[model samples]
Target: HMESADLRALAKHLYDSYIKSFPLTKAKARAILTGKTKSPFVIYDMNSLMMGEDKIKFKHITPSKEVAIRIFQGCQFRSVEAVQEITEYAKSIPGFVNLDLNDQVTLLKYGVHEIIYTMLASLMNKDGVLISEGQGFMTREFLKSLRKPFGDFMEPKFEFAVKFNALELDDSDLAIFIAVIILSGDRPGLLNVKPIEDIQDNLLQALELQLKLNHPESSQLFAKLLQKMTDLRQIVTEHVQLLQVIKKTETDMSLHPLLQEIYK
Candidate 1:
């Protein structure tokens, strides 16, 4: 059995390994989101259209509807990359690999979207998210304006982002939160239910302790954190529905192959 101090330390190590590397602090988020700090110029070149680079990008000058849709397509590809990272990270966790391979794939398919939204919240604040470091900001209104088919997919996520960003949790707090989402026992299919539940419990226990130590003043922080998970489920549920809409209209070539695996 993992003891209190060890679990706490493990949580910190996880924070250092993943969350700290990203290093999105509340003060930084607030400054950028509130316009207290001037954001960098968002530029694109002819090569950018052809090359594989960051996805959430656009020029300050803006583009026509067709150009923007292509940009969003790139963004979806980036989303698949993000999901790929999640799968690799899950594999890194010591106990995760021992689960039945089919169970592992199931968790990745169902939960990656939830995890992505959680990470995206780190880049968001009341106003909007900083989609790319030097590229630009995506205002709530602007994301909602994505051509009808695409924009519908993001509205719930953005709405959730605003409320989640308001929580003022730091990256360390987020590390534990993301663990809870990924290690969840409720994922649709798990052949090794008992062992998976055991690991999930450990992750949750560690997270509860970490949050208690970190958010002493926020009496409701843990409960609120759990609530966000519930909201994330609803957000992703709607996202899946939107994915279906995209599937029917756009050509099979439009969605990333990896994303199609999950969305299917």
Candidate 2:
């Protein structure tokens, strides 16, 4: 039920707790993301419906909004919410809380998106993700329907998710791997770097042993996954760059304040 040096027990414990903390399975997450289920938040346009003397009637849902905008909002809504969940989940990782407060915040700030997208691998197939809660799936063909920069920004992430899912790793493997990602020594602003790296090394070594036992037939899977982290870093850099451009160039785009703060 907690961190341990024992590879067998640590892998099993992290897997058990990881699922319980966020019970939304790949199918469940897909349903929530695709619009088969309702999201916790409302569409961005709903803000207008609640304000001003000229608020529109709400008997039926407002239609005729830009499709690209609606999809963007749904993705942002769910993605950001996923990020929030990762923040909570990471804090509960036993040893993580004992870190300096600023280090904890910095790790979440830098690492949360990587964790969220890795979790996406759990639910993703060769197809695309759920863009609306229930209305439809966002297949590879569907990216074209989204507006220019939005499509450009999100498609690469979906691309990575698809490839990552192709590895067919179970949730247990991901649980420990995420721990390794969070405890990474390279995150900026860590106050106790060596302790954190020690934590990360322990996690990584345990993960390697677990992978050997869990997938005895696979060749170099652990090595491949470590390399994949590098791939993810490249994507995150693109993500950070895109956010910077949006903050500057897309002045009219209604970027969420939290999104701005995270990337800033």
Candidate 3:
């Protein structure tokens, strides 16, 4: 029998030990507690509560109040991976090798940025609270699987960049662009950390790069602009989720008139 004393000590020991080793077990217990694992009934109940037609509507949620913002932020590298994938795709196009070095660079930057924006937009559209009852482990597993294809696409591009134009770009600017892309990819995540002005600044820097290159390769130039706009659209989608959580939590916490009068 699992006695309370034994369970308590075991739980503490697990925490103190290699916590990463027990993800599945932890998820299983979480699913059981939350009523989300292996049960269609739990899904039905949650859908009714969170997605019912009668639910009050609100503006998108802001990142400032989101507890899971960091997790989203941590996943920014995925955006970089996306960019890398597109760059490799561009390189594979016929006549790609014949282009001047500047044109090649332009094409790479533009195509990569465009694809990054597309992925970011897709992610934002799907953004919402991931709730579950039984374990919710499956939810994380699902997300990981979704990210794999994106990552796979990115790896080759990343390697190609390293082999070719790695030395041409300013490291600081590259870092900023990557950081901004990742932050902006997640709506709540971006709102929590980056102001609109910050986003503008990042975009401006990227624009300046286009201009400095004498606006080389018009197609690539257009691609970069489109990519940035797409990223913005994704960010807007994330904000919607933040607003929902804030509104619901506020309504639940509000006291009845009688209770308010008693407190007063």
Candidate 4:
């Protein structure tokens, strides 16, 4: 029943909603860093788009439990902010609000990290990601020094990001892609499968058309992006596993309330 114009309209609506919700331009980030606006408790930069060369820099620090815990704490705060952003964007999805209230929470809980990981590509590179909105850099090696479980956290995500970055998806492309993630009907505990699936299917068709229009020569780009969804599930799995280990091993480290709720 969907026509080409309708698909494009859906795509455009999702794109506009995403832009309105998250105006993460370089100027905005600068304003936050300069104290003109309140800074997010943590900022992640992998693409180096927000931070400049002259900004305050943090490089490799000697590995210790205290530093690792501190970094993880920053991650927790960043995650809290992420939930707000994710919830806002998810609610704006055409059919999201009509879902059962518990289903809405479940979708956000399960899908938030996947969306977060996808967005992290914007601020990531193969070597490391800039954190605290570009005030600090954490190298892969530095994370590795956190040892074993903690060290293992970012590597899988890094692997995923390197390939994902090759796709060159803009914020607009990511808009519908994120909607696809949040509307996933396959997530465990979803109570209303058909409506969720209906919404996701429409979003996927729109996303496919947008990718084809934007990436003319990327013959397999749509397929590759779909494959990344599978890849993300594994990444999220490993992430939760690691977080559980961190919870037990690093008893003193506290996770944000939302994080605890999601991971619990």
Candidate 5:
């Protein structure tokens, strides 16, 4: 029911009050607000808000506004399998092993999934798979069964290592990796996944405890550490639509250009 004017006014206010106040680099600001920067954001009319008798409910037709943001943020991967395959491949490349763990993680977060999808699509192309023909049973099921194996693959390499060698990872890296795994739909097959707010609350409590026990220098380091964790949460919140796109892409292998490449 909203209009483009309404969205534009809101966005302008938000930018003036919040985004404009941040001392982010130009690249960072663009990374934070890509499509959202458009003057007079597009609004889709919906019939659902009509209250007249005989009126029918209609779904709103909103733009996929987050697509550009996700692409710029480097999170628009086709699937979790694509991400995992890319990470493994990148790790195998020379000099990757020599990267500081933080840089390795950064590289994975940004580009691993895209790289893997490209490679996989090329292989599928060579095999003469065509999108017009539809996917075979093997391909369909392979993507379906990818979830469990993807979780297993990451656990040994990242989660287990973090839990066992906690001190080795910077708190920011730990938080980022954990949040990424959770957001990526890899819920550990333990208890039900904790709500994000609750996880954040627990992290805040831990930070508070550290602040109380630590000396000034320790407190400063922990403060910086906590800021990075907070930053990850902020990034995730802003890019929620991107995550949904990833989830949807995993289920339907027919929508992406990469899939078309696979089909060809």
Candidate 6:
């Protein structure tokens, strides 16, 4: 077992790094909800016609050209943001910089979706998620309105986010969780496995301790979180196929260069 002092210090580092990556707090989400503050980036209008009130009335409206373009624009912007955020978070983890450069790229490429979806919990609920850093919200039906393959792209993420939010992890817990995702040894290309595994082991221990300290009464939170990690692997594969379909069918929509690089 690690010493308490060392563990606490590590947790502090993780927490600080996480807060840097995602600056949104629960209070901030509430403030945004109540229109007390505004986010700098606004992709979609809060009064967009896509905002549907009743989930039971299922209708997949054919997206107008303007709506389609706006959705693509929002995705391109968010994709670039996801890369920057995860890269910053990955660099903060202990021993991540020492990995082979190729391995580093591969890990970030493979693990970015997991990181993005995990972070999505902060802005998500069962039916929708806040986007553009809480400046705009996207309901599931708004996304479903996009034609065919493009509409299906966000379905898996919404599924994952709704359940992940149930864990009720605060920023501190998320910091270590994201660290574990980046330091994973199972990514396709890794020159040095031993060091990465060692780092992950330390992170796993920290995660367990953080959960216990944060949720004193819960018995199986650790196992549940790990299960989500397993689920993410499959989710990534599904997304790959879904995006591939979108790329093939919707030739007009351009991807950000970094997204093209990572998804390639």
**lDDT (Cα, tens digit) per residue for candidate 1, span 21-138:** 4444544666766667655433333343333234543432232236446655556655766776677667755477888889888878888889888888776655556655424555
TM-score of candidate 1 relative to the true fold: 0.79
lDDT of 3 by residue, 1-264 (tens): 334454334323323321222122233443454456454212123234233223332112112222233223323434444455545434433334454555455445434443343333211211111222221211322233223232232233223322322123222223223333332323332222324344434444443443345345444543454354554445445544644554465433333466335322
Top-TM-score candidate index: 6
Q: Give all candidates' CA lDDT scores.
A: 0.68, 0.67, 0.35, 0.73, 0.32, 0.72
Local error of candidate 2 at 117, Å? 2.0
The TM-scores of all predictions, comma-separated, are: 0.79, 0.76, 0.25, 0.78, 0.22, 0.82
Q: Which candidate ranks first by lDDT, i.e. highest?
A: 4
How does model 1 fare in lDDT?
0.68
| lDDT (Cα) of model 6 | 0.72
Candidate 6 TM-score, C-alpha based: 0.82
Tell me each candidate's RMSD, in Å, in order. 5.0, 6.5, 21.7, 6.6, 20.1, 6.0
- Poorly placed runs, candidate 5 (over 4 Å): 1-78, 123-264
For model 4, give the 10-residue run with minimal summed lDDT.
56-65
Encode model 5's per-residue lDDT on 221-264: one tens digit a residue. Answer: 54554444454444434445544555565543234567346423
Candidate achieving higher lDDT, 3 or 4: 4
- lDDT by residue (84-122, candidate 2, tens digit) is 667776765658888888888888888987887787666
Give candidate 5's error at residue 222 in angstroms: 46
- Ranking 2 against 3 by lDDT, winner: 2
lDDT of 4 by residue, 1-264 (tens): 689999889888987888776646333433443457433333233333223223443322112346556556556557677778889988889989999998898899899999988877766667766465555545666665564565677577778877998887887688989999999898898888999999999999999899999898989888889899988888888887888887787766655567557534
lDDT of 6 at 235: 83
How many clashes show up per model?
0, 8, 16, 6, 2, 0
Error of 6 at 229 (Å): 0.5
In candidate 1, residue 223 scores what lDDT? 84
